[PDB]
Amino acid sequence: MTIFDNYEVWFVIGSQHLYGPETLRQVTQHAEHVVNALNTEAKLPCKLVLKPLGTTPDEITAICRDANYDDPCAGLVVWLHTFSPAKMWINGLTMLNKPLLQFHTQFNAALPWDSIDMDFMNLNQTAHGGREFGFIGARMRQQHAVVTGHWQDKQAHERIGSWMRQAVSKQDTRHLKVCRFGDNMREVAVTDGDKVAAQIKFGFSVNTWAVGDLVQVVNSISDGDVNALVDEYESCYTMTPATQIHGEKRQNVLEAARIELGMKRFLEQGGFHAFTTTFEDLHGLKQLPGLAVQRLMQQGYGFAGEGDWKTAALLRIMKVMSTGLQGGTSFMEDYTYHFEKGNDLVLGSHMLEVCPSIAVEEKPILDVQHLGIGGKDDPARLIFNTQTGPAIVASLIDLGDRYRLLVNCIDTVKTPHSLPKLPVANALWKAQPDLPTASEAWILAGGAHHTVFSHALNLNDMRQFAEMHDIEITVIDNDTRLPAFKDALRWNEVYYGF
Template identity: 45%
Template sequence: MIKAFENYEIWFITGAQLLYGGDAVKQVDGHSKEMVAGLNDSGRLPIKVVYKGTANSSKEVSELFAAANNEKKCIGVITWMHTFSPAKMWIHGLQILHKPLLHLHTQYNAEIPWDSIDMDFMNLNQSAHGDREFGHIISRMRIRRKLVVGYWKEEKTQNHIAVWERVCAAWADAQDMLILRFGDQMNNVAVTDGDKVAAEQVLGYHVDYCPFSEVLSYFKEIKDADVDNLVATYFNEYDHDSSLEDKTSEAYKKVWNAAKAELALRAILKAKGAKGFTTNFDDLGDVDVERSGMGFDQIPGLASQRLMAEGYGFGAEGDWKSAALYRSIWVMTQGMPNGCSFLEDYTLNFNGEQSSILQSHMLEVSPLIAASKPRLEVHFLGIGVRKSQTARLVFTSKVGTGVTATVVDLGNRFRMIVNDVKCIEPKALPKLPVASALWIPQPNFEVGAGCWIYAGGTHHSCFSYDLTEEYWQDYAEIAGIECVFINENTKVDEFRKELRFNEVYYMLNKALL
C-alpha cells in the first residue's frame, strides 16, 4: 500500500442469501476472505481492501452502507455477488449510499470444473447471473458506479480496481478541500470564472476569497533566519550561477524576497487548512511596495512552483477550478514516477505533422515534470502590477505521452474535457527563461486543438504523464458530470455530434428534474 493512502480503506461487501443454507454462506464468506487477501497481497492496489462480510438481507445491506457512509476511512465500496442475491434487497441500502461504488463482476474459481460440476456447485457459484441481477437494480435506480469485469486474480482486473481506488482517494480529498483565492479572478476572463456554489454541490470543494492584505499579515511575521534557511535550500536543491549567492547583489535580494513570499503563503495555507490557492498578478499588495514595504516585490512564481510540487493545488489569474483539479491529480498520482503540473497554452508552432503547442505560464509550472534538475534564475518580468526582476525555476518537461484535463462551467452543468497529448523535445529558448513543455495534442494538432475549442476548453489545464483516460472517466462518473475525450480515435464530425447529443441530454435531464 502507498503511504499517502494509509488512512484510507475500501470496503468489500459480498452479496448472498440464506436460500441455500448457512453452510453455503460460510463457503461464500471463506471465498470472499481469500479473494480480498489476494487483492491486497497482489501489490497492485494502492489502498487496502477491507472485507466487511456477506449481505444476506435488506437490513444487512442498509446497515453496511450506513456504516460505510459514517466511516471516514472508507472512501469507496466494492460489491460482488458470489451467489444469487435478490436485487430488491439492495434498494434501501443503495438509496442511502454516498460513497463511490464499484461493482466487480468476477467469480471465485477461474474455470468450470467440468468433471465434477454438480447442482451444489451451480447453486453456490452464481455470479454469472447474480451480478446481472445486481447490475439491473443499479441501472434501474440510476446509481453511478464503475463496473469491472474479469477474473479477480488477473493483473488487468486488479489494475482497473487500482485506478478506481486512486480516483476515490482524490474524490475523498476533494470533499473537504479549501481553495483560497488571493485576490480575485483576472478581469473579464470567462474560463477562470464559474459558479462556486454549484462546484461545491457537485464536486465537493469550497472556494474562499482571501484579501491580499491578510497574506501580508503573515508576511510581516516571517523571521529572517527562516528566510535564510530556505534560500540555502534553494541553492542546495537547484542548479544556479554562483553569482546568485552574492548577498550584495540585486538578484540575491530577489531570491531572498521570493523565499519570504513562499514562507508567507505556506503559513496562511497551513493556518486556514487550505489545499490549494490562486494568485492574480494584478493584486500583490501595495502598488508602491518599495516605499511601503507592504507587498510582494515580485509575482510569487517560485513559491507557486514549489508548493505545487508538494501537492498544493494552483491556478493562475484566480482560476480556482484548475487549482482544485490539480490538487486532485496530485492526490491520484501519489507514488507514480513521472509528475503532473498546471499548464497554459501559450503559443503555437506550425510545423506540418509536428505542429504543436508551447505549454508554459509566466512562471508557474511544477518541477515535478522537469526532464532534469531545474535551474534557479532571476530575470525581468514585465507583466502585472510588479514589473521587476523575478525568481523562478527554469526547465523543460520530459519527453513522453500524457493526458491533460480541464473542467468548464457551461451554465447548466460542468464539462470535463480530456485530451491525450505527446510531449516532444523542445528547442532552446535563450530569451524565454521559463519552465515549459511542448506537446502535440492527439490525434494531431488540427483535430486535438480544434475539438478542445469546440468543447469550450480553457487555456489552462492540468497535465499528468501517469494518468490515462480511465482515471477521468471514473472521476466524472463519481461526480456525475459530463466528460468528453479527445484521443487517437477522435474525428471532428463525430465529436461535434457527441457535443450536440450531450447538450440535448442535459437540457432534457434538467427539465425532468
C-alpha cells in the same frame, strides 16, 4: 505516509440467508481468501476490508449505513457470490452516498467439468447473481461500475485499482479547500463561475483571503527561516550568477524565499489544499509569487493563475489522484505554436508558475525577471524543460448549467534547439490528432487556456473521473474527427440538459 492510507474500500459479499449455515460458511471462506490475497499480492491503491455477510435486507442496509458514516470508507466493492435478491439491496442502495463497483468474478477459474453438480452450482453462481444486481443498479439508474474476470486476473486488479483510485479522489475532494488571494483577472470569463455550484457538485470550497492577510504573514517570517530556505535553494537548483551570493539580484531571491514561507505558513494554518494568486492585486508583496508557487505545487498544493479556482482545485485533485503513479502533473497554459508541415507543436508555460514535478533535470533558478505584468520586482523562478512521453491536458469549464471536462491526449517532445532567451520553464507537445483539429475541437467545445498537464494520469483515468462525478467528458485524441465530435457535443447537450 500517503493519503490513500486514510481510506479503505469495503469488500461486501451479496447473497441470501436461505442457503444454509454451511453454504454461507463456505462463501466467507472464499471471501477471506480473495480479500487477503488481494491485499497482499494485488498492489491496489488502498486496503480492502472484508465486511460481514450481506444476506438479509437489514444487514445490507446496515452495511450501507455504516459505509456512509465511516469517513475512511471510500466505496464498496460487491462480489455477487451466489444469488442476492436485489430487493434486499434496495433500501441500502437508496441511502448509499458512497460509490460502488460490482466485481463480477468467480472463486474457481476453470469449470470443474467432471465434479460439477447441484451442490457446487448451489454455491458460487455469480454468473446470474451478478446480473440480477446489475439490473437494480440500471433500473435505479445509479453509477455502479462493473469489472468482470477471475480474482487472480492481473488485468482485473488493474481495473479494480483505478476505480479505487477514483473513489478515493472523490472523498478527498469533498474536503478540498481553495484559498484565493484576490479575485479573478478583470474581464475574464473562463476563470469566473459559480463557486456555490462547484461546492454542491464536487464538494470543494473556494473562499478568498485578502492579499493584505497574506502580507502580514509574509512580513512576520524570521530572517533565519528565510536564510535556511535559500540554503535549500542553493542545494536543489543551479543558481545563475545574479542569484548567487554577491549577485545583483541576490535580495530578489531572499524576498522570494520569504514569500514562499509566508504562503506556506498561511496555507498550513488555514488547512488549505490549493490556492490562487492575481497579478492585478499584490499590494504589500515585493514580487509576484513565482519560485514560491512552483515549489508548493511540487509539494502537492494545487494552483492556477489569475484567480482561477477551477483549475487550482483540478490540479490538486489530479495531484492526489496521481499518488503512487510515475509522472508529474502541473498547472499549464498554451503559450505559442510552431507551425510546420508534419511537426505542428505547442509550447506550454506560464507567466512563471510551472511545476518542477514534470521536469527532467536539476532546475536553474534565475530572476532575469523584469516581469512588467503586475508592476513589481524581478520575481525568482525555476527554468527547466519538461519530460518526454505520453501526456494529457485537462480543463474543467462551467457552461452555466453544467460542467464539462475536456481532455486532449498529447505527446511531449524534446525541444529541437536550446531556449536561451526564455526566462520561464517550458513544456512542448504534439497534440493528438494534429494541432489544427486538436485546437479547433478544443475551441468549438468551449474550454480554456488554463489546463492541468499530466504525465501520470491518462484518458482512462479522466473517463472514470467524469463518470464518477456524472459530467460530460469531451475527448480529443487520435480517433477524433470533427463531424462525429460535433454530433457528440449536440447529443450530450440534450442528455446532460436533464
